[PDB]
Design a binder for this molecule. Structure first.
Ligand SMILES: COc1cc(CC(=O)O)ccc1O
Length: 326
């Protein structure tokens, strides 16, 4: 069977804490007043919620209301506990209230408002300096949540809200987040296709905070190379082949051999044999001003098959790529 794995940082952060911190099932939700909020417009609808722009009538301030779909109780308590645990942390969205929606009869989470723009609206037009600046801001959020024993598991441009005018960033949508417990096997059906780490794609369940670092590398590659998405898979299987056409198949086999993982046999007819490509293959006249030797070295240290070999969030903050950032 598979070889076990453990995070190389923040391994035992939950083990030493009282059960109150991480046992979300036992958490008692403190309800606010639903009449304090007036819904203004629907922003979007996903698999588990409907999101609205609203106004807090007690202070005339703009807020965002996420009304959860009646799909599951466990997911709701987990998200609430995580948001309350991380509240006030650097670049973490602030949960302002939790009210019972009168129509859906489900919880409605009330958040601070950032801007009607997600990072996906801006990330393909930033300057070199702004890519470094905002990447450093995302790292502050990731090191904080990892230091608090939490993995986000859905890092992607849509989950980074940016107020470009005020140079402010928030990491949102903690609905897939989980507490890291060493030796725990987790569900691999997390993160969006293009940002899924190889551990999810090869069905390795004992993953950790390092999954968020792969997703962050995918965002960086997309920004510096002006290729969205960087790894453009047609489904979860082709997603791994797209990665192997860049990182090569030999390092993929070394990864699965290290953890004694057996690839799904469906890969026998689609994976092939691919050499590792040099990062310079992705540089062209249109993205060259975003590429530097420091950006390429940093990217190379995030996009590694072996989750234990990737930079941690704190090591990433130490990288030369960020030396120019004030
Ligand atoms: C679209 O803006 C926001 C979206 C969300 C949604 C979430 O955290 O799941 C929270 C706060 C926001 O400001």
């Amino acid at each position: 069977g598979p070889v076990p794995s453990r995070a190389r940082v923040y391994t035992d952060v939950n083990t030493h804490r009282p059960s109150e911190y991480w046992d979300y099932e036992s958490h008692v939700v403190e309800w606010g007043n639903q009449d304090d909020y007036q819904l203004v417009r629907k922003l979007g609808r996903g698999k588990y919620s409907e999101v609205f722009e609203a106004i807090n009538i007690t202070n005339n301030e703009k807020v965002v209301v996420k009304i959860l779909k009646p799909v599951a109780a466990a997911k709701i308590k987990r998200e609430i506990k995580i948001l309350e645990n991380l509240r006030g942390g650097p670049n973490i969205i602030t949960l302002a209230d939790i009210v019972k929606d009168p129509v859906s009869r489900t919880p409605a989470l009330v958040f601070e408002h950032v801007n009607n723009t997600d990072f996906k609206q801006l990330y393909q037009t930033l300057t070199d300096y702004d890519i470094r600046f905002y990447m450093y801001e995302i790292l502050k959020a990731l090191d904080y949540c990892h230091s608090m024993g939490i993995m986000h598991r859905d890092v992607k441009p849509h989950n980074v809200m940016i107020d470009h005018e005020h140079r402010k960033l928030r990491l949102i949508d903690w609905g897939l987040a989980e507490f890291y417990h060493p030796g725990q096997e987790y569900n691999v059906r997390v993160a969006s296709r293009y940002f899924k780490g190889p551990e999810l794609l090869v069905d390795y369940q004992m993953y950790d905070y390092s999954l968020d670092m792969w997703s962050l590398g995918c965002m960086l590659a997309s920004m510096i190379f002006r290729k969205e998405p960087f790894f453009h898979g047609h489904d979860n299987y082709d997603q791994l082949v797209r990665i192997a056409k860049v990182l090569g198949t030999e390092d993929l086999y070394d990864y699965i051999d290290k953890y004694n993982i057996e690839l799904d046999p469906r890969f026998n007819d689609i994976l092939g044999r691919h050499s590792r490509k040099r990062w310079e293959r992705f540089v062209h006249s249109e993205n060259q001003h975003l590429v530097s030797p420091e950006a390429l070295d940093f990217l190379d240290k995030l996009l590694r098959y072996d989750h234990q070999s990737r930079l941690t969030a704190r090591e990433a903050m130490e990288h030369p790529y960020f030396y120019t950032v004030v």
